[PDB]
Amino acid sequence: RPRTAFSSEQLARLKREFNENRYLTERRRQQLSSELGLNEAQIKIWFANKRAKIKK
Template identity: 40%
Template sequence: MAPRPDPTRIPRRRTTFTVEQLYLLEMYFAQSQYVGCEERERLARILSLDEYQVKIWFQNRRIRMRREANK
């Protein structure tokens, strides 16, 4: 049986990135597919995002790149 969802838990909203944020993230990704802690902090400040959002974006972008390479 699947676990029951917690009725008190509020689901996290999906982050919608602006065109400018995506452009800058893609520019940084083209330079390096991995960002360190300090660079992630700096990027998050510049883009007005959480560090976690930047981290997850890079993870997802690497996965997408690998999928496209395997086609």
């Protein structure tokens, strides 16, 4: 699976979503994937890493 740089608009929307809830449901992750032009697995791993860093 290729690494990818997220455009600032993508990170903005992801942090916006993460600010409300650090956990993403499957249906919402699909909606976001389609809205941001991002693979679901990228959104899923982003959230996973984000939660781990916020824990430090």
